[PDB]
Design a protein around this ligand. Structure first.
Ligand SMILES: [Fe+3]
Ligand SMILES: [Fe+3]
Ligand SMILES: [Fe+3]
Ligand SMILES: [Fe+3]
Lengths: 283, 282
């Protein structure tokens, strides 16, 4: 059936206009960040440190490929307003921009062989493939609200967690221009998670008590299914440079943030999410 | 199952040239100052104002469809990951195009005129029919047909609604509005091209019998859209005396759409001889 022409002179929810204006006013492309000034500092990393960074960036690239090309678009049919549909087309585009920014970093700093090996690792890593399957299954299913749970967990939990490393390097005066690129991605991702979680809460208010309890159950279930897999992914990547336990605190910190974006309470208390202060500055 | 995109290996570089051109042409409606058209706008008859708002509202409808359904419906049928990325850009920019008509309206028009135009768009049977013909193709299960419909939408239906703002611009009226429409045109020319190109790439992957079916469908769909567009054009442009010339522009654009899909021009040059001031104004 019918599509109505959109009328931006009759807003149904002013939040849609505010998010449009913010997301569009923050438009950027990766070519405008001078990553080539990181070449000296990338030279000071060991082969193991460079491999870890490339692998983490390849995993993030996967999540943005999923969010732009499947995630954000699968939300469009469930919009409450026409203007939300428009915002979702911007979010899809910007996820593609985020995914391409990693290729711009690699193109400036790394060799073809190192890149090919990072992409091959991502195809074969069981934890990365499992995290993709879990969100893809929710996006392709037929329950709108559960899809926004998965999306917010992708934006505010899974994604945010791989940002640890560029911020760890930045805090040691390394790879500072790469860190600037990543802060452009975070500035988008904080809005996406906020907006999608907002629309989730508006959707929740229109269902009965039973459905609402079902969604809180599902949120916790998917959160801990993702969290379990994310810990295993985190261990295999970070164990050798010794950052695992601090990244796991960052994961707990971010899980709380995902829950709050959805309108639920923080689960982990403050003294168990106490990330190295330098990492928090760098965001 | 979804692989991370690698922009350092391209199955088809065309995807990266198109990405570079579309993203490099990024714009938002507020950058164009339409308020300088306020005096020009007062020189139109109520009829000419109504015609302009109705045409703009039809175009808004098609951009709403193309951003929110069309471009995204094309993403599962992509040949490359880079094409899927391009399509997210196209979907976004269609939402910008649609928004731009609201920017024009909010500067120049009254609330009651805006509402009249949106209501006409809900009710007009030729506009509803064009919308249903393309939505049915977009929501169907035949990828190459969907590309035919999307190319006819970008290169034939949309482009035809650009006649009016270029008409006004050729009389030195509404020239800022015109600069806005030329930003849309610069994106649409690439959209139609690119999608038609991907149609041609996809034709090489099926067999000769299927290609022959698609050529039939293309003609049939064109004839149906053309005829519906003539009725639409007549009801809009008959009173101001523009119909004959717009109909030449419809054929002119029907040729571009066919050629974007890799087919021959249907109408001969003596049938597409649109007022040269309108072509130049693009
Ligand atoms: Fe992203
Ligand atoms: Fe995002
Ligand atoms: Fe458009
Ligand atoms: Fe277009």
């Amino acid at each position: 059936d019918r599509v109505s022409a959109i009328n931006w002179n009759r807003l149904q929810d002013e939040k849609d206009a505010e998010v449009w204006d913010r997301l569009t006013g923050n438009f950027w492309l990766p070519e405008k960040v001078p990553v080539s000034n990181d070449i000296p500092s990338w030279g000071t990393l060991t082969a193991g440190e460079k491999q870890l960074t490339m692998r983490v960036f390849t995993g993030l690239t996967m999540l943005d490929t999923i969010q732009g090309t499947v995630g954000a678009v699968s939300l469009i049919p469930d919009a409450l307003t026409p203007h939300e549909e428009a915002v979702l087309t911007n979010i899809a585009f910007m996820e593609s921009v985020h995914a391409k920014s990693y290729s711009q970093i690699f193109s400036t700093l790394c060799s073809t062989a190192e890149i090919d090996d990072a992409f091959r690792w991502s195809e074969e890593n069981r934890n990365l493939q499992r995290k993709a399957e879990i969100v893809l299954q929710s996006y392709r299913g037929d329950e709108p609200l559960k899809r926004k749970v998965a999306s917010t967990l992708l934006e505010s939990f899974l994604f945010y967690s791989g940002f640890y490393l560029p911020m760890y390097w930045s805090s040691r005066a390394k790879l500072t221009n790469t860190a600037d690129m990543i802060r452009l991605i975070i500035r988008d991702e904080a809005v996406h998670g906020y907006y999608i979680g907002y629309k989730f809460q508006r959707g929740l208010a229109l269902v009965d008590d039973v459905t609402r309890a079902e969604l809180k159950d599902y949120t916790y279930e998917l959160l801990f299914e993702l969290y379990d897999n994310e810990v295993e992914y985190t261990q295999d990547l970070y164990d050798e440079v010794g950052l695992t336990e601090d990244v796991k605190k960052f994961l707990r910190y971010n899980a709380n943030k995902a829950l709050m974006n959805l309108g639920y309470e923080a689960l982990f208390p403050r003294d168990e999410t106490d990330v190295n202060p330098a990492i928090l500055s760098a965001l």
